[PDB]
Structure formats: structure tokens, C-alpha cells
Design a protein around this ligand. Structure first.
Ligand SMILES: O=C(O)CNC(=O)c1nc(Cl)c2ccccc2c1O
Ligand SMILES: [Mn+2]
Length: 221
């Protein structure tokens, strides 16, 4: 499906109505599996961190660590299909220009690849950008073949602002997710009991990012 059609007929109206949008079968099986192979190779070759320190025990060998990350630019050897994913995300956002709220996206982060190792850790409730740092859209791509949350957990639970309900999103293979990064969307990752991979990119709003430079100072003489 052409990126522009997906953007105009789905992403734009969904984001303006719900602020949370799911695209299944984004890249297709072949490409999705190649991305999975690249992420697994990063893991198997030691490129991820050891994981977020969750619980400190008196014996440090018993410390519990959770999500593991690595930052990816997309041109690294062994990462070019991740790069292709990022370019595909960028093309979608570009086709949405000037239609996602009143935001004007002019840049993004590198990709944050995350691995929940399957040891019952998740991620606490949080907002991605609560303090005006420039990030307006979160884009996540999931890689987990035959993920079944009733068995393996790892649901992303989002709590759209001022709603008596939440939205549970399974981290399914070849699924792409968009949501507003600010306080519209507090969210959490429920405990994961199998290896769970995702790739996140954040897109910046031009105005917010420009004035974030002021708030968070950059020196000339
Ligand atoms: O993986 C998901 O479905 C949702 N994950 C997150 O919301 C998430 N958010 C943040 Cl800000 C971080 C931040 C650092 C490491 C992992 C994160 C993460 O998985
Ligand atoms: Mn988050």
C-alpha cells in the first residue's frame, strides 16, 4: 500500500481523532523478518545495554535488570534494514506534513531499539515528553512473531487523557504504532515473560524544539 495513501486515508484522520494509530503488516513478512534478524544479531553480539536497573539487592549478583537498549542510526553494517524501516517511517510522516494537529515536524531521533528480556520486567507508567522537549509523535515498530500476550504478557497499555478506559496494544510482528508523545498519552509496558523487541523513533515539532533550546541550554564569544 502506497505510503501516501496510508497517510491520507488512515494516519492523519486517526491521529487527529484518537492520537493513537495502529498499522498492521507495515513492511511485510520478508522485510520484517530481516529486521528481526538484524535486531537479534545486535543482541547476540553484545550491542545492547545490560538493562534498566529495576531492583538493587544486597548481593549485586541478584540485581534485577529490565529493558535493554541500543541506539541505531540506520547506516551501520548489519543495520541497513533497520535503516530501511526508519526511512519508511520518515516517508509516512513526510506525507502527513501539516496535517498532524498544527505541528510541523522537522526532524527526529535516532532509533531506540529496546529488548525486554522476558524476566517479568516491564516499564512503569510514564509520559514520553512531559516537559516540552520537542518530541510530538512516538513511532514504534514491533518485531515479535506469533506474540500471544495471554501467555507472554508485554502489552503496551495506553491511557488517553481524560478517558475512563485504556487501550491495550499487543507488540505484534510487523505492527507500526503512532501516538502523541506528550501528556495526551501516559502509557506502560506490562511485564514481559518472553523476549520482546521494539524499535522507536520520536519526531520533533519545529516550534517546540526551537524553544526547548532556550529552556534547556550553545555558547559563543
Ligand atoms: O515498547 C513499547 O510498547 C512501549 N515502550 C515504551 O513506552 C518505552 N518508553 C520509553 Cl520512554 C523508554 C525509554 C527507555 C527505554 C525503553 C523505553 C520504552 O520501552
Ligand atoms: Mn514510552
Amino acid at each position: 500500500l502506497p505510503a501516501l495513501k496510508l497517510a491520507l486515508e488512515y494516519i492523519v484522520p486517526c491521529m487527529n481523532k484518537h492520537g493513537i494509530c495502529v498499522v498492521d503488516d507495515f513492511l511485510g513478512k520478508e522485510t520484517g523478518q530481516q529486521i528481526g534478524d538484524e535486531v537479534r544479531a545486535l543482541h547476540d553480539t553484545g550491542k545492547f545495554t545490560d538493562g534498566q536497573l529495576v531492583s538493587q539487592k544486597s548481593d549485586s549478583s541478584k540485581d534485577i535488570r529490565g529493558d535493554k537498549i541500543t541506539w541505531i542510526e540506520g547506516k551501520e553494517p548489519g543495520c541497513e534494514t533497520i535503516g530501511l524501516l526508519m526511512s519508511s517511517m520518515d516517508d509516512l510522516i513526510r506525507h502527513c506534513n501539516g496535517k498532524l494537529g498544527s505541528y510541523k515536524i522537522n526532524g527526529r531521533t535516532k532509533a531506540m531499539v529496546a529488548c525486554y528480556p522476558g524476566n517479568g520486567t516491564g516499564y512503569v507508567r510514564h509520559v514520553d515528553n512531559p516537559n516540552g522537549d520537542g518530541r510530538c509523535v512516538t513511532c514504534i515498530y514491533y518485531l515479535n512473531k506469533d506474540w500471544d500476550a495471554k501467555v507472554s504478557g508485554g502489552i503496551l497499555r495506553i491511557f488517553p487523557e481524560g478517558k475512563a478506559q485504556f487501550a491495550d496494544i499487543e507488540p505484534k510482528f510487523d505492527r507500526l504504532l503512532f501516538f502523541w508523545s506528550d501528556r495526551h498519552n501516559p502509557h506502560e509496558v506490562q511485564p514481559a515473560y518472553a523476549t520482546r523487541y521494539a524499535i522507536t523513533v520520536w519526531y520533533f515539532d519545529a516550534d517546540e524544539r526551537a524553544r526547548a533550546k532556550v529552556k534547556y541550554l550553545k555558547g559563543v564569544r
